[PDB]
Amino acid sequence: GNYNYLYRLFRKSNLKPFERDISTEIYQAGSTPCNGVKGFNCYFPLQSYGFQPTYGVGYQPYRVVVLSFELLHAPATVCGPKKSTNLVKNKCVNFNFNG
């Protein structure tokens, strides 16, 4: 069982987009103060996923990479590669050199 991967199970409010919460403060589900001890009505936010090889496909670990593409008023410089059609000389051709 691999207990190195965790997830935040509780919080008072929902997250904003692209927010990271790495706080390890005890969740208060009740009126009584937790006072740092995981007693009655006070639980720990991060819970592990006990990843075992014999799990179902809906419980197996999946690595997720999310690529976020934004355009800002600065000049865009991370450009996808363009191709290079084999240069032909001594003929009337339509040339496109660097725009």
Partner: protein
């Protein structure tokens, strides 16, 4: 903030950690069952102790949330399931005594070895040493010797243990605000809080009597026919007017009558529907058996098995070097892990058992979306009933012809249907009065209607009245004759087989009406019917989230268990038995006329 949201978060944390711990415990039990080794026993015991301690701590923490401030029915159901004390309400000395009594009954039943006096150099255990003798012998005094000697040893060991057991279980049940332990067992069918669909603990006994009063003529005719055939087999022992001798029923206790099919066959000259030789000729592996079962379940519209099922299940006996339990068991280990542990042979019985256990697997897969503590059947009857309907559908000659296992020129006349229905009645109908009599006797023992000095005088009186089976010789109060059976000696409910038997034919009528089958009910096959699978899966997906009355409304359209589908299933056999019992006398006499 509110109590309900606090309970919901507590249930969420409970669920999350419970699923993982139940997985660890179930995986340890799996590793014990596929590999009987002492370190696997130690790992199983450690995981079970952790699971029980975790259930104790969550039961201790769940009670602090009062029930009446929660309005959501599913949350209230999970909190009701969690807040049960169990044995924790009892004192530590009496709880330890009860656990010790249960463990020593388990050791007495498992390691009970009985053989003939004056020949003690080797002895035979119950499985398979005594089972084969009870199922295959034709000698009166040998079966009488085995029956009386095993009830002598087991009853004289277990009688003070059972006398302590009833008192401790009644003390635990009255400490849990129940009338008796029988009320605790009947509380599984208790539905409270739903308008119209409420079911009471006291309504269960009345419904069982009401259904058994309609069971009784069919069982009387079957008993008369079996009595006449056993009179033909044994000339002088059986009386025309009296009950059947106890040791002649084909099994150790009378649980099933399916070992009397050779003696009581109507038309021996006609062939059987045995397909074993056809699979041997076509070399059908157990993998092919499970793939044909998967083809059956995808034909009705249910989901197919996962890759982890095929990777992680043991569908063949491993060998001599590695020991495993031979009993077929479907395991829902948790987290989408579904396995079958069966030592599958090339027989019809193993093929039907494969369909039955894959029906168990389909039932477990259907409620995987539910929360962890609601991942069960709506009652104890549905879980077995959804496997028994697959055992019904797979056994049909239409299914065997469809998959190619039976010859296309096999003649389906009325005589083969009559003897097949008689075999199914000996398996299915014959266990019903024994089950009802055993559960009613245990309910009267727990309720205190029967004093301890009068347990057996009433019990045989019940068996003559209900089962129509007479004792060979009278037994005094030094015997403990019920507790020689596995379920009663190891603290298991027994009404699940009665409810399973009635729900089986109710589900069969509902799915055959869904599949638009136009013939007899026993000729019906639920393959190729998407709508029958959808009607099944609507109930299957609920799990324990909904009441069993509402689930039965979802399947059959009735709010209560019904006896008419069983009588409709055996109606050709019922007419045939009524024709065959014209000269003979239906019914029995409680007097000592055969033997005492």
């Amino acid at each position: 903030s509110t109590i309900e949201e606090q309970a919901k978060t507590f249930l969420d944390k409970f669920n999350h950690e419970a699923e993982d711990l139940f997985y660890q415990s179930s995986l340890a039990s799996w590793n014990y069952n596929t590999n009987i080794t002492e370190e696997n026993v130690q790992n199983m015991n450690n995981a079970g102790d952790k699971w029980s301690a975790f259930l104790k701590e969550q039961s201790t923490l769940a009670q602090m949330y009062p029930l009446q401030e929660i309005q959501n029915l599913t949350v209230k159901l999970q909190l009701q399931a969690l807040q049960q004390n169990g044995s924790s309400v009892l004192s530590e000395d009496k709880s330890k005594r009860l656990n010790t009594i249960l463990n020593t009954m388990s050791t007495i039943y498992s390691t009970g070895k009985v053989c003939n006096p004056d020949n003690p150099q080797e002895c035979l255990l119950l499985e398979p040493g005594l089972n084969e003798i009870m199922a295959n012998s034709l000698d009166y005094n040998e079966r009488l010797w085995a029956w009386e000697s095993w009830r002598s040893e087991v009853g004289k060991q277990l009688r003070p243990l059972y006398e302590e057991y009833v008192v401790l279980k009644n003390e635990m049940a009255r400490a849990n605000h129940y009338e008796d332990y029988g009320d605790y067992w009947r509380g599984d069918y208790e539905v409270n809080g739903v308008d119209g669909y409420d079911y009471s603990r006291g309504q269960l006994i009345e419904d069982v009597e009401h259904t058994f009063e309609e069971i009784k003529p069919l069982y009387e005719h079957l008993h008369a026919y079996v009595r006449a055939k056993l009179m033909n087999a044994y000339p002088s022992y059986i009386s025309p007017i009296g009950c059947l001798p106890a040791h002649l029923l084909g099994d150790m206790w009378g649980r099933f009558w399916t070992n009397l099919y050779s003696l009581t066959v109507p038309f021996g000259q006609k062939p059987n529907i045995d397909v074993t030789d056809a699979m041997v000729d076509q070399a059908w592996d157990a993998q092919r058996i499970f793939k044909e079962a998967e083809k059956f379940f995808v034909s009705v519209g249910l989901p197919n098995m996962t890759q982890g099922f095929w990777e992680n299940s043991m569908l063949t006996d491993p060998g001599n070097v590695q020991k495993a339990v031979c009993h077929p068991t479907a395991w829902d280990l948790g987290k989408g892990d579904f396995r079958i542990l069966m030592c599958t042979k090339v027989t019809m019985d193993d093929f039907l058992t494969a369909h039955h256990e894959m029906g168990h697997i389909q039932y477990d897969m259907a409620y995987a979306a539910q929360p962890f503590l609601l991942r069960n059947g709506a009652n104890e009857g549905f879980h077995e009933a959804v496997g028994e309907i697959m055992s019904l559908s797979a056994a049909t000659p239409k299914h065997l012809k469809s998959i190619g296992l039976l010859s296309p020129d096999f003649q389906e006349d009325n005589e083969t249907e009559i003897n097949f229905l008689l075999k199914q009645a000996l398996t299915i109908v014959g266990t019903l009065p024994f089950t009802y009599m055993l559960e009613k006797w245990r309910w009267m023992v727990f309720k205190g209607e029967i004093p301890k000095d009068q347990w057996m005088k009433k019990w045989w009186e019940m068996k003559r009245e209900i089962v129509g089976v007479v004792e060979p010789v009278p037994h005094d109060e030094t015997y403990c004759d019920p507790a020689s059976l596995f379920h009663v000696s190891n603290d298991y409910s027994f009404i699940r087989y009665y409810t399973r038997t009635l729900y089986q034919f109710q589900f069969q009528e509902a799915l055959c009406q869904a599949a638009k089958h136009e013939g007899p009910l026993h000729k019906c096959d639920i393959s190729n019917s998407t709508e029958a699978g959808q009607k099944l899966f609507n109930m299957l997906r609920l799990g324990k989230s909904e009441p069993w009355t509402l689930a039965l409304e979802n399947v059959v359209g009735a709010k209560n268990m019904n006896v008419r589908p069983l009588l409709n299933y055996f109606e050709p056999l019922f007419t045939w038995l009524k024709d065959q019992n014209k000269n003979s006398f239906v019914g029995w006499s409680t007097d000592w006329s055969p033997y005492a």
